[PDB]
Design a protein around this nucleic acid. Structure first.
Ligand SMILES: Cc1cn([C@H]2C[C@H](O)[C@@H](COP(=O)(O)OP(=O)(O)OP(=O)(O)O)O2)c(=O)[nH]c1=O
Ligand SMILES: Cc1cn([C@H]2C[C@H](O)[C@@H](COP(=O)(O)OP(=O)(O)OP(=O)(O)O)O2)c(=O)[nH]c1=O
Ligand SMILES: [Mg+2]
Ligand SMILES: [Mg+2]
Ligand SMILES: [Mg+2]
Ligand SMILES: [Mg+2]
Lengths: 373, 373
DNA sequence: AGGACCC
DNA sequence: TAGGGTCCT
DNA sequence: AGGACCC
DNA sequence: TAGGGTCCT
């Protein structure tokens, strides 16, 4: 139980893909999906004309005045397609980890080894790769690790074929020996393709990054910190003093981000299984007076009730969340959590009143059901 | 799945019992178990001379200058006897809930019904109670609920017999239709006896309480609150306005404590299973300079390492906890949590250094291992 | 992290 | 005024 | 409850 | 500048 083969699958322009499948007339047209004033994502025809992901509508329509826009506020169809994808991959190997609605990690290590024991001592010389080899690295067919990664590339090609034939969806895959590297290498050939990373190329891939914010796991906060410390490239982070860093971000945050700077990441792929919460949200900037706005709370509820329902399990907790306006409080949401009374779990009319009183102990409103059973 | 039969088992003067079993020469002598300046508990010979539970040593030895004292700082033997008791009860019925080291709830409902279907349509008239009937209530052998509670009293008598024959331990049991009432009724005949509560006596038992702090679930805090609201007896709490209370303690805290004031409590008996944390502590008032005291941290560790070991499972988290002195900050402990590095989980010498740095980001010190797997 | 509650 | 422990926000 | 991180 | 989601302190 040492060397792993992991694949990271990452779909193309996910919400746009789903909209292009719904209305074929949007294909071959530059297409953005809009949520409020945000073009959250756009198909590849639109990225040709300069549309980037997460541009405001304005910036997007003066970079490209001909861009089609569809509303993507309601996530229901993206969410349903996201679970179809995960459940397809779970069929190849049960332990599938989701990240957001369009990425899945799968530990192929068992599956690769069982294919290897199926091949006789001969056809092992005919193993080839499927897709690109990062940094155009030469393969050595006598290196057991290259062999396993290539079988891994083949599983990846079958998963993406299946996603295409069964669900109509294209995407990218990255095959590597842990999750960090599979997820970095899945973006190297962007549109609907796959890349495999051999160990000799690990430092090349990790040094190809131009800022430590690009390392999955280093966020808006830790990045700003690392800077204030003159740590700007991945190599600065690799060479920086362990102690200074230990004693500045916690043992935890420090010992881990420094591993990742090397390309080292031992986190297992975890079975995501069913969601741990179900929430809906609404944005409406400056609209919530402060009592004329609980209706809103009923809207949220309406959908939520249907969703939480359907799963099977019932939630044992309810939560209410807000924010408010003046200057750029860069972070500042508030919430009040409470247990859902047992009579109520077995509908609307009291829920509402749990929320209303929760709302009282109290730009934007949401409701979250959590603690499912 | 409506009416339940629950038993609450509550051992006599637990730590003292254990000490009296270790050193028989302490029997028939008034015995207190001491932790620092606190006589945490005392056997029944000592309660005759005025020793109460949780008296200071001073107050205890001038109420009773002849009282024997043994040190109970080290909990190891009380903890081991506590699990022997729980595992014995789990043998009667698997779902056993612990509360502290010497109380266990068991849902006898399945066990009672299967004994009932074993008795032919005749010997059902010969069912008798074992132990006391709260408030000396008359039994009605044609009341299915009285019958089930009496079979429940008989299971209770077998559990306490078994605890005595197998482990040498005496205790009390309370049989009732939910956990609140079984735990209130287990103290009515205190020393080594058992009481059963029939439904007609529920209001009598709940009104026998002299302050709402006595209701399991209403603590130091909510009690002081309830007062500031003129709510002093259980009847005040029962009659108080639901809304005023809803809108003053949360929907949660309010709707629940008001049920309990009635004797109503639907919480299931939960399987406690293995512990969710392992911690040790040390008190030493004014002793921790502020660097001369990490040794202390090594001591804690030493035992902890042995305990967490033994279970099987390993902990994935470590925590450090403190407090400090001036005036009576009535609540004020602090802690810094961090993940235990994966190399380390498979010993002392780095642990120490996780703690030491945790101690730096930072009257009394403790270490807690949690998040077991 | 800390709060609140239990033994 | 000890030395533990549980679950919630 | 809130923080921090991800898509 | 959206609408979701996960796990930790
Ligand atoms: C990062 C991010 C994505 N999304 C949504 C929109 C995306 O279509 C979807 C997937 O995120 P991504 O995979 O980052 O974006 P993408 O699939 O749209 O584009 P690409 O082809 O480069 O992979 O999740 C958000 O709504 N908010 C976010 O901040
Ligand atoms: C309440 C409490 C108990 N204990 C310990 C000492 C006790 O022996 C043990 C059990 O608690 P209890 O059952 O309340 O006390 P007891 O068994 O000693 O006395 P009784 O015969 O009245 O039931 O837990 C503490 O250490 N601290 C506490 O605050
Ligand atoms: Mg992505
Ligand atoms: Mg994508
Ligand atoms: Mg007790
Ligand atoms: Mg006791």
């Amino acid at each position: 139980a040492s060397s792993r083969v992991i694949v990271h699958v990452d779909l193309d322009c996910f919400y746009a893909q789903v909209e292009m499948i719904s209305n074929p007339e949007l294909k071959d047209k530059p297409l953005g999906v809009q949520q409020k004033y945000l073009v959250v994502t756009c198909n590849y025809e639109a990225r040709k004309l300069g549309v980037k992901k997460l541009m405001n509508v304005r910036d997007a329509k003066e970079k490209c005045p001909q861009l089609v826009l569809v509303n993507g506020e309601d996530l229901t169809r993206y969410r349903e397609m996201s679970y179809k994808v995960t459940e397809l991959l779970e069929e190849f190997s049960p332990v599938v980890e989701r990240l957001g609605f369009d990425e899945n990690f799968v530990d192929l290590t068992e599956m690769v080894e069982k294919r290897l024991q199926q091949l006789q001592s001969d056809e092992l010389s005919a193993v080839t790769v499927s897709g690109h080899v990062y940094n155009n690295q030469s393969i050595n067919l006598l290196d057991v690790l290259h062999i396993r990664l290539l079988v891994g590339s083949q599983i990846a090609a079958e998963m993406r074929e299946a996603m295409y034939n069964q669900l109509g969806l294209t995407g990218c895959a990255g095959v590597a020996s842990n999750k960090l590297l599979a997820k970095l290498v899945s973006g190297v050939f962007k549109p609907n393709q796959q890349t495999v990373l051999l160990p000799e190329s690990c430092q090349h891939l990790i040094h190809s990054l131009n800022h430590i914010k690009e390392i999955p796991g280093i966020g808006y906060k830790t990045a700003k910190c690392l800077e204030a410390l003159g740590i700007n490239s991945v190599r600065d982070l690799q060479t920086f003093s362990p102690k200074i860093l230990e004693k500045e971000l916690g043992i935890s945050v420090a010992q881990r981000i420094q591993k990742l700077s090397f390309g080292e990441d031992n986190s297992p792929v975890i079975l995501s299984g069913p969601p741990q919460s179900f929430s809906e949200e609404d944005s409406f900037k400056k609209c919530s007076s402060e009592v004329e706005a609980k209706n809103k709370i009923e809207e949220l509820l309406a959908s939520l009730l249907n969703r939480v329902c359907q799963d099977g399990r019932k939630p044992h907790t309810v939560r209410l969340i807000i924010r408010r306006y003046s200057s750029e409080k860069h972070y500042g949401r508030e919430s009040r959590q409470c247990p859902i009374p047992s009579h109520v779990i077995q509908v609307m009319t009291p829920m509402v009143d749990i929320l209303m009183k929760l709302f009282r102990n109290m730009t934007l409103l949401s409701v979250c059901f959590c603690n499912l059973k």
